[PDB]
């Protein structure tokens, strides 16, 4: 059962649920760490969509303003 | 607006979360792979106890400190997550 799995340490290496279709933000933050122009580049990808970085499924454009895209980019890159 | 708020209200939440996947497969995915597969309980109980590699990737599951009875109970529980 679930309680036995927890006690035995199984959940250190296993999630109950599958990953979402896009990359986890902590992974995005780590990928861009120490990269020039990360903030601006990520804001553009959030607004305009992106592909070929993490897998075969593209991210479509998002209906966000320039300011919203920058806010979100900075927040993503800060996830430590 | 706060990014946490935008993250939810602009649809990002449909496709993204904060935390990365753990090293082994998600139990929901194990359940899906082995549903209706003959001998799934005994197969998985064996892997849980003995450890193994190569089915989901090259990262191994170490042998686990469980009794045979616990390994079977854990396999049965995982197979129910669907
Ligand atoms: C709502 C506004 C958001 C925000 C803030 C982000 N996304 Fe997505 N995203 C999705 C997929 C499949 C990818 C990977 C595409 C590929 O393989 O190239 C992404 C990528 C991102 C990133 C990382 C960009 C990079 O180049 O590293 C970031 C920061 C990001 N997203 C933020 C999928 C989806 C969705 C599926 C339908 C939706 C909706 C969104 N993303 C929305 C957002
Ligand atoms: C605690 C007792 C548990 C339980 C109940 C399970 N695990 Fe793991 N596990 C890990 C890795 C890397 C894998 C993939 C191995 C491969 O690619 O072949 C697995 C796999 C499983 C399965 C599926 C086995 C299969 O052949 O399909 C199951 C049912 C499972 N585990 C249950 C990694 C780890 C850990 C990392 C250190 C730890 C701890 C555990 N697992 C513990 C458990």
**DSSP letter, residue B45:** H
What residues does each domain of chain B span?
3-80
- Whether A67 has its CB under 8 Å from any CB of chain B: the answer is no
Q: A22 vs B16: CB contact, 8 Å cut-off?
A: yes
Solved with: X-ray
- Quick one: which of A26, A18, A21, A19 has its CA closest to A60? A21
Q: Which CATH class is domain A5-78?
A: mainly alpha
**What's the resolution in A?**
1.1
What phi and psi values does residue A11 have, to the nearest 5 degrees? -75, -5
The C-alpha atoms of residue A55 and residue A5 are separated, in whole angstroms, by: 31
- CA of residue B1 to ligand 1 center, whole Å: 19
Domain boundaries in chain A? Answer: 5-78
Among B7, B9, B13, B20, the strongest candidate for a mutation testing the A interface, having the largest count of A CBs within 10 A, is B20
H or E element that contains B71:
helix B68-79
> Do residues A30 and A56 lie in contact, with contact meaning Cβ atoms separated by under 8 Å?
no
From the number of C-beta atoms within 10 Å of its C-beta (0-12, 13-18, 19+), residue A42 rates as buried
CATH superfamily of the B3-80 domain: Cytochrome c-like domain (1.10.760.10)
Instruction: Write phi, then psi, for B52 (nearest 5 degrees).
Output: 170, 175
């Amino acid at each position: 059962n679930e309680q036995l799995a927890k006690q035995k340490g199984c959940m250190a290496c296993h999630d109950l649920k599958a990953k979402m279709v896009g990359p986890a933000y902590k992974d995005v933050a780590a990928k861009f760490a120490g990269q020039a122009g990360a903030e601006a580049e990520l804001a553009q990808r959030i607004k305009n969509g992106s592909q070929g970085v993490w897998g075969p499924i593209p991210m479509p454009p998002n209906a966000v303003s320039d300011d919203e895209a920058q806010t979100l980019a900075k927040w993503v890159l800060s996830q430590k | 607006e706060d990014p946490e708020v935008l993250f939810k209200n602009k649809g990002c939440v449909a496709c993204h979360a904060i935390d990365t996947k753990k090293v082994g497969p998600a139990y929901a995915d194990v359940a899906k792979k082995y549903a209706g597969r003959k001998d799934a309980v005994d197969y998985l109980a064996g892997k849980i106890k003995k450890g193994g590699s190569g089915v989901w990737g090259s990262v191994p599951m170490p042998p686990q400190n469980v009794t045979d009875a616990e390994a079977k109970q854990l396999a049965q529980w995982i197979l129910s997550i669907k």
